[PDB]
């Protein structure tokens, strides 16, 4: 009865949801037809699966893209029978790595179609908590249409807990050229709207899928499994009764000290292969040190170059709360994990009774416990300092600006987004320092 609908913008957001809704069907015994064999659940599915008249459950997902091809693979894939076909929204031409086409030219066409499909879902939700917007900072749809959409949901709702799961652009891996433009522009808009936007990077999952999973060749099939285990473990406390539950309203409360700073970086553990499911015992003390280890985070940032402002350990499965305190009290004593001077209480702890399940065809191993760390840290200021530096090199020559001015955007609006991003950059410098006396 604590319903939570999810929006999937861009090619990245749909392909993430193709693994997320694959994972949710396995956690509730749902077939791809929706007909779950009810031959123990007890309204566990309710936060994502509005039930139809038959024995068929359909998801609370709005898959939106401006180009049809990534939606049409869902429409012809295994989960054809699952999704409501009015939710699968297509445009005609993509925004095509153009923020202004996602926000002014093409995005204005179907934005009233998307807000209609949200409002049909939001009316049949009786205890609606918040939103799960899946998008990327690189593409024109995931930047332009999301920023157009987050303008509209804060107008229509405002008080709902609007959460994002963004694909942050990597420092040296960039599959697009104007990622320094689409990321600065979409963050200038989503700053005053999104309650807590979870950063995820591709390169830091290229590190994890090569090292921790021992996969030589990780695919975007595999990177979306690890993001699905994050979003499942955040919504594991809603869907399943835990020893210490945590709502989506609790995440924005415990992790966001200032309304500007709402950019935590997720971290999942244990990420081990099937051969290494043995050879280690995986205590809650063992899987907690994996999260604060800087090599195992999922945004390419060095947390030793900054300070954690608020960490959020979301345990699930066979977890004992006394050994939790044994795992956490040691980490505040370690010097490499340091907090900010004003935060003595740098933790929010959640425990679920359900283990993470493994998707068949997956690369993770069957483990009896997991942890989804959601740590808001000062180390992301190193990430924004790169991205303004990638912005300032391109914009000083006025490169690629005519692809954005010719789609309705002011040239001076880039001066607005960059100076606002510079104002966000000094905020981590303002918060990262200690207090006088």
């Amino acid at each position: 009865m604590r319903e939570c609908i999810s929006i999937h913008v861009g090619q990245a957001g749909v392909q993430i949801g193709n693994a997320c809704w694959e994972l949710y069907c396995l956690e509730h015994g749902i077939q791809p037809d929706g007909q779950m064999p009810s031959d123990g659940g007890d309204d566990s599915f309710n936060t994502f699966f509005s039930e139809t008249g038959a024995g068929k459950h359909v998801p609370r997902a709005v898959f939106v893209d401006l180009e049809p091809t990534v939606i049409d693979e869902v429409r012809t894939g295994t989960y054809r029978q699952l999704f409501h076909p009015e939710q699968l929204i297509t445009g005609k031409e993509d925004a095509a790595n153009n923020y202004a086409r996602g926000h002014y030219t093409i995005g204005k066409e179907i934005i009233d179609l998307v807000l209609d499909r949200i409002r049909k879902l939001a009316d049949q939700c009786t205890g609606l908590q918040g939103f799960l917007v899946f998008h990327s900072f690189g593409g024109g749809t995931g930047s332009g249409f999301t920023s157009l959409l987050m303008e509209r949901l804060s107008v229509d709702y405002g008080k709902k807990s609007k959460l994002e799961f963004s694909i942050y652009p990597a420092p040296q891996v960039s599959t697009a050229v104007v990622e320094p433009y689409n990321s600065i522009l979409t963050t200038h808009t989503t700053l005053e709207h999104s309650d807590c936007a979870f950063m995820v990077d591709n390169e830091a999952i290229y590190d994890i899928c090569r090292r921790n999973l021992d996969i030589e060749r990780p695919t975007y099939t595999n990177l979306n499994r690890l993001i699905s285990q994050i979003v499942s473990s955040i919504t594991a406390s809603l869907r399943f009764d835990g020893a210490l539950n945590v709502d989506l309203t609790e995440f924005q409360t415990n992790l966001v000290p200032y309304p500007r700073i709402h950019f935590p970086l997720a971290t999942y553990a244990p990420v081990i292969s099937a051969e290494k499911a043995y050879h280690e015992q995986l205590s809650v003390a063992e899987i907690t040190n994996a999260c604060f280890e800087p090599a195992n985070q999922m945004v390419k940032c060095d947390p030793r170059h900054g300070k954690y402002m608020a960490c959020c350990l979301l345990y699930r499965g066979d977890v004992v709360p006394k050994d939790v305190n044994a795992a956490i009290a040691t980490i505040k004593t370690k010097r490499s994990i340091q907090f900010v001077d004003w935060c003595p209480t740098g933790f929010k702890v959640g425990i679920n009774y359900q283990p993470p399940t493994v998707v068949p065809g997956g690369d993770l191993a069957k483990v009896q416990r997991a942890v989804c760390m959601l740590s808001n840290t000062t180390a992301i200021a190193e990430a924004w300092a790169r991205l303004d530096h990638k912005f300032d090199l391109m914009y000083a020559k006025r490169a690629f600006v005519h692809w954005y001015v010719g789609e309705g955007m002011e040239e001076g609006e880039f001066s607005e987004a960059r100076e606002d991003m510079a104002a966000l950059e000094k905020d981590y410098e303002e918060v990262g320092v200690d207090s006088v006396e």
């Binding site: 406390s237 539950n245 924005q252 409360t253 200032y258 004992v320 305190n325 004003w342 003595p344 702890v349």
Partner: protein, 429 residues
């Protein structure tokens, strides 16, 4: 008579209470259904304090289970002893506090509290002669800190004479379970010092030790920690529910343990606490139960009492025992620890003996300690508060929910008007 309405706020207070009504239903022989299935009428003599008798000789627990999300209640209402509560009592919202005090006390708390008090007033008028309300919540959460301290401010206005004992799970010294728990505690201690007659500070760090050190539990879940909190909770009102050779109640423990009306922050303690094998290698005597209480490693509030002075001390005993064997040991720990007890309260030990032991026990204790050792409980939190507040971290998740900084300027000063009072009455000659 002297009925007690049990109120549960937060995820924590429900998980304590669902274990608490497992203990009460075993002490009174109550089945999972709600019917009496004990052996003697002494369980039915004072059955009415926690139970209303329904039709068909069934008993419903006089309990009001409050949350802001349905995730905790559906674990309660579908688990064991979940079919015993009334479905009317489960008054829960949908939005969730979000681990926020302001959403628990101003925004989502106020949009539910009128549907809670009408269940309170329904249960309060079903009481014959109301003794008072007991509350189970936390100070690190958002609901149990917000909705709980909103319930106390409504009740003390509507019931000024009744006792209001809260079982507040105070946050732990080493680890946190919440980033903003110095904010949720200090905004709740602002509301606890003015509207509760007593308050039992419990720390999860101390119960992590007592399960590992004293009971030798390598894997203690919350179901093992809550059986230690509920052992105190049933042990406080065990002389109100059963005959004893020296009966106490929630007003004797209010008068004897609160020398000054702000200084009603107690630490509990339980004895005996044994392992599985190590319980047949130990003589269960009153001198064994006495010295097990008064050490540092049996305080459920994570602070050493040696850093302070005991103002007042209550030792509620259960099971058949002799009073001289008690009254010597209540004197014996006061002779050797004469500096550890406060001086200007001579003979500061309250004694209560119940005749009914716990199920599976020969005899048992329940320590209540009011010390100046919990000035360090608030020296730690107000230092963790001021370090976060001087940078105004996480302020906009409270200011955006209808709050100013003057709320924090008062709540921090109210706690330091309490730290200075325990320092005043520890330095008192």
């Amino acid at each position: 008579m002297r009925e007690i309405v049990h109120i549960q706020a937060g995820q924590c207070g429900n998980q304590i209470g669902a274990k608490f009504w497992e203990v009460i239903s075993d002490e009174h022989g109550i089945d999972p259904t709600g019917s009496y299935h004990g052996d003697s009428d002494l369980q039915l003599e004072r059955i009415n304090v926690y139970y209303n008798e329904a039709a068909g000789n069934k008993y419903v627990p006089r309990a009001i289970l409050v949350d802001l999300e349905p995730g905790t209640m559906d674990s309660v209402r579908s688990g064991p002893f979940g079919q015993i509560f009334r479905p009317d009592n489960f008054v829960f919202g949908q939005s969730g506090a979000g681990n926020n005090w302001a959403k628990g006390h101003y925004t989502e708390g106020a949009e539910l509290v009128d549907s809670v008090l009408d269940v309170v007033r329904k249960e309060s008028e079903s009481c014959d002669c109301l003794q008072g309300f007991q509350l189970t919540h936390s100070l690190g959460g958002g609901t149990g800190s917000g909705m709980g301290t909103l319930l106390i401010s409504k009740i003390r206005e509507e019931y000024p004479d009744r006792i209001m004992n809260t079982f507040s799970v105070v946050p732990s010294p080493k680890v946190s379970d919440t980033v903003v728990e110095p904010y949720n505690a200090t905004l709740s201690v602002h509301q606890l010092v003015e509207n509760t007659d007593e308050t039992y500070c419990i720390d999860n760090e101390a119960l992590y030790d007592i399960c590992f050190r004293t009971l030798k539990l390598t894997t203690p879940t919350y179901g093992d920690l809550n059986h230690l909190v509920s052992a105190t909770m049933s042990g406080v009102t065990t002389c109100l529910r059963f005959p004893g050779q020296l009966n106490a109640d929630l007003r004797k423990l209010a008068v004897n343990m609160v020398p000054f009306p702000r200084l009603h922050f107690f630490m509990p303690g339980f004895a005996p606490l044994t392992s599985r094998g190590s319980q047949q290698y130990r003589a269960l005597t009153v001198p064994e139960l006495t010295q097990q209480m008064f050490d540092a490693k049996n305080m459920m509030a994570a602070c050493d009492p040696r850093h302070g002075r005991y103002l007042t001390v209550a030792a509620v005993f259960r099971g058949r025992m002799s009073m001289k064997e008690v009254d010597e040991q209540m004197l014996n720990v006061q002779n050797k620890n004469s500096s550890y007890f406060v001086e200007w309260i001579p003979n500061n030990v309250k004694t209560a003996v119940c005749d009914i032991p716990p199920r599976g026990l020969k005899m048992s204790a329940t320590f209540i300690g009011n010390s100046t050792a919990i000035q360090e409980l608030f020296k730690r939190i107000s230092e963790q508060f001021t370090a976060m507040f001087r940078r105004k971290a996480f302020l906009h998740w409270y200011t955006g929910e209808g709050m100013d900084e003057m709320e924090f300027t008062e709540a921090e000063s109210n706690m330091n008007d309490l730290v200075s009072e325990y320092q005043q009455y520890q330095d008192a000659t």
